[PDB]
């Protein structure tokens with residue numbers, strides 16, 4: 001129970017990878033405060049799966065791209081729990097299109113949620129962590145941020161951006177004993193991959209030395225490592241969890 | 248005359264590194280189309296220095312963060328020169344602050360000029376280069392995009408973003424023979440640099456000195472020429488050994 | 492105990508970081524097989540510390556640069572314990588000098604122990620792991636393998652080489668479900684660290700964002716992560732444990 | 739003529755990429771001193787092609803894995819041309835095999851030539867370059883040194899090692915203004931379907947492409963670049 005009584009904030013906790021991160025942290029003893037934006041019922045369900053592990057949990061609506069929402073979100077976290085030991089910046093979206101026809105709003109929305117939202121949530125949690133002289137920030141990037149991917153210029157830019165932001169953050173907060181790292185998932189069995197056709201899946205599997213999509217638990221286990229004392233001398237790093245796709 | 252007959256578009260060409268890029272490309276025979284945003288007098292100085300090399304040059308006012316300005320800019324470039332063979336995305340700004348104190352405006356302005364502007368200009372030039380089945384795009388990043396830097400969350404995010412965008416662009420445009428690369432300057436002597444801050448910066452550079460705008464221009468020229476035709480999706484650090 | 496019943500081979504396990512890796516893996520329930528050279532005294536101390544955790548342990552004399560020694564070492568590991576679940580390639584030496592002054596034997600000795608030793612041990616364990624359709628290899632590199640270091644051309648080349656070899660190995664063994672990763676330590680405390688001049692310590696700590704040397708437990712914890720189910724979708728990676736020295 | 743009056747030493751100059759590096763440097767006005775090991779007839783052909791550009795050229799037998807050969811090679815280079823301005827460490831071999839079947843000799847031969855050879859030549863040229871307070875060293879790596887490649891554990895280890903060595907050399911020699919960099923070729927056409935699929939540009943590169951990257955890193959055009967690896971691989975590794 002390596003996180004017993006820690007307080008973890010998880011953005012995008014209402015479903016997918018974020019829900020499984022919340023549950024995994026709860027399994028290790030962390031109390032959870034997470035957000036949702038468009039899915040209230042999904043948040044109820046995360047909250048019940050988390051509560052089964054005997055920790056305290058609270059959900060709150062917040063759009064991470066909106067500074068006002070992010071400010072109220074962290075204020076309430078601190079009101080409820082007094083501290084934030086772990087922040088997981090997991091909220092993210094895709095709006096895939098060829099660069100040549102990519103719409104300005106497809107660009108803006110992905111940059112604003114994925115990159116700016118991570119900046120906003122980092123900014124809002126920074127003072128509490130600096131006063132605590134302790135904290136872990138885990139940003140959710142993607143291995144395509146490392147290598148590029150046709151049809152995803154906005155997403156790639158946002159995730160490469162997050163990796164750069166992770167480094168600056170790590171440099172700024174390191175003197176107060178705060179670890180800041182990123183996880184870079186490859187292709188994980190999720191709603192994203194559930195929508196794909198056989199030819200597309202086949203070509204994706206061919207890029208993975210292990211020959212299979214990862215699981216949400218693989219990603220949660222990386223976040224857990226980076227949220228715990230087991231990684232206390234690691235900062236400013238991106239951990240790729242991608243079956244060998246990017247070496 | 249490595250670029251004789253070529254047309255190069257340079258964003259941020261009115262001063263500094265962009266001015267020296269434009270002059271260097273002109274010295275190799277390229278006609279230059281470049282933008283300015285708030286410095287018409289500087290733009291006219293650049294134009295004169297470019298024209299001295301025997302090529303044609305035009306400057307046009309445009310904000311690279313604004314989609315409508317970018318569309319008009321590239322429209323006018325094609326009306327003036329008939330084609331675009333080289334795009335150098337050099338326009339960029341900084342609005343430094345500790346991340347805990349960084350204002351939403353400081354974040355947005357830097358992301359929109361440095362990163363969105365590079366996207367918009369790349370998008371604008373892409374169909375033209377695809378039709379030509381030839382082209383070079385050189386994006387200006389920074390070594391702080393590679394390693395991070397305290398006080399520059401926005402700038403670092405934008406430049407690391409540019410590096411990723413460079414790679415996606417290279418992938419999308421490679422089937423039509425277009426090269427797409429990035430140059431990552433370290434500490435370069437300019438008006439902006441010329442404290443104890445300087446001595447601490449020098450201690451980070453194995454060569455022991457700031458670089459010159461000509462060093463950066465020379466990297467850009469290499470990546471814009473036939474000498475680098477099998478190079479794509481790469482970032483070239485021009486930093487005196489600061490980041491290895 | 493997350494490695495209950497596993498067998499770990501740790502090269503260089505008789506002292507320093509190697510010893511602390513062997514002890515950490517023993518505390519998670521792994522039986523330990525390790526090599527030594529010269530006097531058995533350090534090896535005797537390691538075996539004692541390991542056995543206090545209630546697992547089985549055997550030391551064997553073997554020089555990792557020597558093919559014959561390696562062959563016999565792995566044969567005896569199989570004879571003694573049945574299988575090899577984890578291999579930690581930690582054997583390593585330095586012979587520092589500026590390039591101008593570096594002797595040919597100083598070059599060869601370091602390349603042979605650090606790089607060739609990793610190759611020979613990897614080769615020796617590979618058929619066993621392939622047959623098992625399971626296994627973890629963790630190679631010990633160094634952050635100077637990533638960025639270079641004056642006076643260490645041989646050491647740097649060897650550890651950079653080890654990082655490349657890690658990637659080839661991961662590629663060749665991925666189809667049998669074997670994970671292969673590297674750990675890159677930064678500046679880690681030894682019992683001489685405290686004795687250094689203040690000027691010396693300050694110049695080293697200036698290069699580290701976290702502002703302190705790491706511990707051998709920090710390194711052992713990263714190895715443990717990479718030897719466990721928690722990292723089963725991670726392969727071909729180098730994990731830097733360096734307080735942010737290299738980002 | 740960017741390199742008029744310069745003296746370039748090229749290892750592995752008798753064939754393939756090294757031959758074209760030598761020619762390209764000559765084209766820019768450099769005198770050329772290069773080695774061969776097993777191919778004197780190919781070395782004569784290289785020398786004739788270099789001599790077309792009006793520069794002086796000499797070939798000399800040397801195994802870069804042998805310290806005595808390397809010392810004599812560099813000694814003769816200095817005797818012949820007075821100085822060395824540029825060193826290109828291009829000699830290299832492959833001896834492929836799956837890790838589990840790879841022989842100790844296949845490992846040793848590739849490490850000794852590709853990595854130890856680059857160390858030995860770098861060591862030999864370093865004193866004269868330091869005394870000059872000028873020089874350029876370009877090492878030949880490979881993109882598989884960056885990402886790994888099944889069947890090539892020896893080659894990959896050797897080239898990844900060269901990249902690390904490049905960084906150390908760059909740091910040790912930067913105080914006297916010597917630039918040290920590496921070129922990492924992808925698939926280059928030398929003397930199919932699956933290789934091409936991995937290259938975004940959709941074609942193998944040419945020896946001229948590699949030669950042009952070497953020339954850039956050997957010239958004043960790159961004087962602020964050191965400790966870098968330039969991948970010339972049609973986008974294979976980004």
Ligand SMILES: NC(=O)c1ccc[n+]([C@@H]2O[C@H](COP(=O)([O-])OP(=O)(O)OC[C@H]3O[C@@H](n4cnc5c(N)ncnc54)[C@H](OP(=O)(O)O)[C@@H]3O)[C@@H](O)[C@H]2O)c1
Nearest residue numbers: 012014015016017036037038039063064091092142188190
């Ligand atoms: N799936 C993969 O294979 C994969 C690969 C690489 C990286 N990743 C990264 O891992 C993270 C999670 O991915 P996923 O596949 O689990 O995505 P998902 O299933 O779509 O879940 C996304 C989560 O983010 C939240 N979210 C979206 N927009 C938001 C906004 N404006 N404000 C606040 N929250 C918002 C959603 O909340 P609501 O639904 O309540 O709005 C939801 O809980 C993402 O950052 C993604 O880029 C995933």
Ligand SMILES: NC(=O)c1ccc[n+]([C@@H]2O[C@H](COP(=O)([O-])OP(=O)(O)OC[C@H]3O[C@@H](n4cnc5c(N)ncnc54)[C@H](OP(=O)(O)O)[C@@H]3O)[C@@H](O)[C@H]2O)c1
Nearest residue numbers: 259261262263264283284285286310311338339389432435
């Ligand atoms: N100096 C260095 O050491 C260094 C290091 C790393 C990276 N870089 C990068 O290299 C590039 C140029 O650097 P520099 O030092 O030469 O910069 P600089 O002298 O400050 O010039 C910046 C240029 O960007 C233009 N610009 C500003 N806002 C704009 C907008 N909204 N739309 C269009 N153009 C705009 C300016 O034109 P107006 O004056 O007309 O507005 C100006 O010509 C930048 O991308 C920079 O980030 C420089």
Ligand SMILES: NC(=O)c1ccc[n+]([C@@H]2O[C@H](COP(=O)([O-])OP(=O)(O)OC[C@H]3O[C@@H](n4cnc5c(N)ncnc54)[C@H](OP(=O)(O)O)[C@@H]3O)[C@@H](O)[C@H]2O)c1
Nearest residue numbers: 750752753754755774775776777801802828829830880926
């Ligand atoms: N071709 C590619 O696609 C590719 C890809 C990645 C990297 N590279 C690298 O680029 C470099 C050139 O390769 P290449 O394809 O052009 O090979 P190559 O010329 O066909 O043959 C290797 C060259 O190295 C010399 N050589 C071999 N062993 C030697 C020794 N012990 N001492 C001295 N010289 C020796 C040979 O000389 P003799 O014939 O006289 O013995 C020959 O000139 C190599 O380092 C290679 O690893 C090439």
